[PDB]
Amino acid sequence: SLSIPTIKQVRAFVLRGGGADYHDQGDGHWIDDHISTPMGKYPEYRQSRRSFGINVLGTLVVEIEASDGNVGFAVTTGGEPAAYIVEKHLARFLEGARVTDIERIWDQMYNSTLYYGRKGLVINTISGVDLALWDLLGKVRREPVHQLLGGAVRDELQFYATGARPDLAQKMGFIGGKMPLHHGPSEGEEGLKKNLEELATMRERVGPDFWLMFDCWMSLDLNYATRLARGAREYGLKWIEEALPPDDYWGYAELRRNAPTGMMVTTGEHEATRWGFRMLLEMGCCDIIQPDVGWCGGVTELLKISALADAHNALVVPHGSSVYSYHFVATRQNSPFAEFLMMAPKADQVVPMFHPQLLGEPVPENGRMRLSRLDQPGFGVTLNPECQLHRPYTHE
Amino acid sequence: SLSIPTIKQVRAFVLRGGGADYHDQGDGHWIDDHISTPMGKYPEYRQSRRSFGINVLGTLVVEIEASDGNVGFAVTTGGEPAAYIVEKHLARFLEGARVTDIERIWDQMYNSTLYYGRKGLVINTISGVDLALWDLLGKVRREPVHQLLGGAVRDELQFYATGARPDLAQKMGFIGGKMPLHHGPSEGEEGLKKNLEELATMRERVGPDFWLMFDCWMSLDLNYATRLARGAREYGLKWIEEALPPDDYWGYAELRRNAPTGMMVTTGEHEATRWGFRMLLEMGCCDIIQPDVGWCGGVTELLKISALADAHNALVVPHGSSVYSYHFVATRQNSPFAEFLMMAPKADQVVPMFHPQLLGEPVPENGRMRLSRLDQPGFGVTLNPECQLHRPYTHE
Amino acid sequence: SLSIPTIKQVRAFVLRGGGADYHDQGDGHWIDDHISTPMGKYPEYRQSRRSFGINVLGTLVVEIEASDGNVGFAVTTGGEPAAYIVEKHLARFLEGARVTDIERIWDQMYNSTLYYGRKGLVINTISGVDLALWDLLGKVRREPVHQLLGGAVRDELQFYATGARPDLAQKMGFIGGKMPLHHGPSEGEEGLKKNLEELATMRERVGPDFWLMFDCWMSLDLNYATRLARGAREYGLKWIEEALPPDDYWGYAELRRNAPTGMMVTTGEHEATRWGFRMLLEMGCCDIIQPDVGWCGGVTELLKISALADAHNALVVPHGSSVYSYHFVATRQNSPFAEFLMMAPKADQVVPMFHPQLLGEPVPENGRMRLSRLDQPGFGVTLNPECQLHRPYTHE
């Protein structure tokens, strides 16, 4: 017998520069420094990911106003094409609904966009609406999102750090260091040696116990990944992440079989929905699944993905997605540690992931975050008023 | 921002005489009239389920008092042995916890009782405590439980009725009638003819379109179930329910292959946890899963079970458990209709399912329940003060 | 030693009203008349597909100008969000390339968009660029596209007709009639009877031999599709098409097993790339695969999809996509007949499919098309100058 507000209006905005699009940069950043990609077989696209257009979309901001004056928002990747989808297509299912109608809303967004959806941009868009809906609901109930997700199961988050400097991540208190791979199969035996040299160097600097992992960003083939993982076992690599293109379900299962015993094969960043993850889990593709909350369907969908993994006794370590991941992973038994992305250009200082777009964003202190930092309603952040919002589309 | 109360005490009561134990009944009920069981191979044990001791436990009542004065409660089947387990084992994980610590508490309960749990009585007990925690959280929040489970996805529930008179159920506006099987394999060819005559009689009464189903209460073998299912094709039987003992996963998968095409094989009321239902789904055992919320692991666990069935594109139609089902199934895309047990002795009028235990319990009117009937906090019921609770155990 | 031109400029335009978006209508059309969809479980979205936003995108026109003054174009579904992708992302891979660089271009478009692509809108966009590239190449060589695809293997195309009136399609010379399904699972036994009545009526009108098929537009579940196909065998239904959501690979394989012997199960309209079709073929999902040229990756990708099917000895009967399908299917041994979509509102006269957008569009005469009608360079059509082109984005 609480008075549940209805949704008055949904708006989509475009923002540009850093934030929820991680690869929307323009400087001397590690995240654009010769990262191996599927495009790296072309020499002219090898140095920079921005050169093939990793930064083309920008940030989608979804804002949902309720009848009580509460506003939820989320940031994700999608920019102007995603804003068109929110305003012209998706908003019709939201406006006039109760803020508790979350299951209904997701299903309607998914079913209505199926003919041009399933994976990719359209699912990113759905996810951003979903996140904004969970933020709004938390704001309405005056509760952090983790309290709406069955409550935290640990009083502290522990992080590994993703970036070019695991050695410095160690000095900053993190439990591990995930490095990007810099050389793909088209650089032959020399690029392989270089990959292994980088790992050797970092291992020498950190000692035998600190976790090291490679992120390969879809860039290898089965034989190269097999040979890299075999080479890597000398330096105690914990896992090889996203070795293959996301459509290569058969390849991942082969790789996992051919991996050194005790080394993990992980994927799932570019996978969407319960049915994408069912395929990974059932085919044996995967030791850990690593969906992006903002790209896999949102919190609502990730909840079902996570329970799928629960039945499979698999780990779920989501893509670092600032508060959108922290509130989720706090509540999951199958998520014992979390990813933090190093968004400083030299990966040499801890910096908020969604700067400058977000305010109230907590960050790991000495590689940890107390649950008591996640005490504010919704996802506990506000949109920075200094950020320049464009609304390219309207509806009625 | 909202201040979250802690759990002050947990109490375990025993009630006897109807309610949550469906089979805790007096004389002259359909539910004890010659129902086919695994025990019917003994003629001494064939007429009455009470004679082999279907009614030995009765009702466990779990009460949880929060620090703000709020009290959540749930009823399930388990009685005095379950009450030992709540008071002496389980209450240690609850007392002093925040009322939102739901995922944690479940995990602690399951993992601490593993050495003597996994299935059966201990899971019933965990489910009861879990249901009481959801009741409490709903009461704290001043929201019905469906609003905590992602919102309703439909305006209205629609019911089939379970009992010996689907012809009367049709007049009362139900969509379907499920009838208990009365003869098992040991009664031979005459039993088979009697089973099918019973179905023929009801089909003649109801017309061609009305759904008819058989519930076999684990009582068959593969070949009898196959032949029963084949004979029932002529009268358009919609599904065969719980044909086989719940450990016979291999059998269920064979029966579903052997089934007349278009006819469903259903099970799972005597199955528990995500891993039990993973076996069922992955082995292709059934078209519909039918867990009892009060026997399978509670709302917390059913949530994961339901997500697993989402991924498998299977239906979940929970074994009717009054308000504990109703609030759940309202929210699930994969539960499009619901079970209503006909708890009247002659099955000739709608009676509240968990009568006389629960005050304020909604019933189907004309086979339907508007979602506005479930607008009261928690599961929307109060314990009948005219019921006399025994407390067999305390704890420090 | 021909002088091969390079690509000067790519442009993306938006058009609205009919054409390459088939469901972009606004009248009394059969194609929006109570078609069963995944959204049909909601009564308010049941009557009209436009009500959930099937028409939200519009038509993408991709125009590619070469250095010799030749211009290729294609029309597909995608509208303004697709136009953004063409102009801002994709055009960089095309401008400065030789017009023969088709394999290189496709791979670069696919690999660069993988992080937000794989299926759906992004693949539609790629397909439209690809089609425009093949049109351009044909214009340059002064040859129809079928001559660039290994040449036609038949001198005539034979069509079935998709629409609400197979009886009239028969009088117009077509070999078959594919009808849309009007009632889904949520309309229960009554909607089933109605579906079967429609098929009964049409069968009575056409005689025993004329092909009848159902298109279900992703709208059923396994049991409903199983029961519909079993019901349908009395009236000699040739195939059931797109019964299930496109992610339900496991469901399709089950359905195909449970189909009446000799009845075909088909899908693939909402499937993309070689790897999507590999999954369908290998899992046994499918008797015929039915990709849309404008949605599966374009001609370049469909060529590999088709050769996959060749190895599988499976039929490929693409979605009717006017000239974009006719030039392709002419050359394929595994494509012995073709789809024609009935774009007249009452499906009562043969009408060009991409009217008003295209000029020079051939249409079946008496259910057939001579290969001699496909004698003009490229896909042999021109953009109607009366159509109102908007260019919402530019680049440099």
Added chain:
Amino acid sequence: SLSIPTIKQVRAFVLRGGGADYHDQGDGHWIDDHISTPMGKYPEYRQSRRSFGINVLGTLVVEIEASDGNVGFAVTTGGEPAAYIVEKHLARFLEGARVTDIERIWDQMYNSTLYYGRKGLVINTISGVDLALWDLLGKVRREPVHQLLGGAVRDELQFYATGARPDLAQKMGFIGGKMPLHHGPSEGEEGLKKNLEELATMRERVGPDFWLMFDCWMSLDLNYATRLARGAREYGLKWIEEALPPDDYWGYAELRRNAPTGMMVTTGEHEATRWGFRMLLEMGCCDIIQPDVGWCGGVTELLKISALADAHNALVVPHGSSVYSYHFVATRQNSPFAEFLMMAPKADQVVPMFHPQLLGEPVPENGRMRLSRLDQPGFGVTLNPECQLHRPYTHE
């Protein structure tokens, strides 16, 4: 719009002495120096492949004259028996056809010869005719064949060299050296040691990084191949090629499982058609497929084979067939390097592969071939007028 010439005549010639028959050689060649074969279990047949009759056929030359005066040609292995087949069987499908009728003609050739084809000599003949049709179409169009096959995907080919001197191949700038096996299972433990000493010697000469490969010409059994592969691990053998007879699909799949992890198993030079290569890929027989364009079904069929390997994410590295490979592999994303046979007797200098048959034949310079070297129409070669063609058959 461009007027398409018809096929006027087809002629079949026989040449002897090098060229397209690799094994049609005189004395003192490495390619006949004690090469391990299935016949080496007979000591009488161990020293020389010519002694069991590797050289019995020689070169089939197929010439096709179009009505505009253009003449296409191809060389493959088959000689006088193949020439019977071209003239008496196959020419009926070609004469009077448009030169673009390539898919049709292939299909007619395959389907008319099925009763005595499927594999082997008849497929060689079909491949020769097919290659000549592509030559003709290129000459008609005034385009090289790579521009008809979707365009080059790379600026440059890179080669490994096949012959008894990979040490000399390294100095000549090749990326790799593949060496023939000289001892098979019947030569026992000493043969095995000799095989590995040979590899050790080359590894010492070339350094650690240069690719080394063994080509076993069908000569092993499973256990010998497993033990050979295991011994070769120490010297970093990149792949084992054609270890087993081509009918032993089950064997290849076992060997690849038994292989040292990271080492590739390759086959397919003596395999033909899409269905042969489907068996190979689906059974997990090999990491690289290696068809000969002149033995597998021609360019038309290789195109489908290549697409099947695309879907399987496998590499296609065709068995070097001079310009017929080079034009093909230029276009394929899945052929990143290419084979060059060292046709010099002592393998000490680059000699044109199909010398003395083909005038204008390009060679690798420094292990590489710029795409600008293949700028001449068709396959860019002319028949050497100093070669003396026999015409054993005519036809009406």
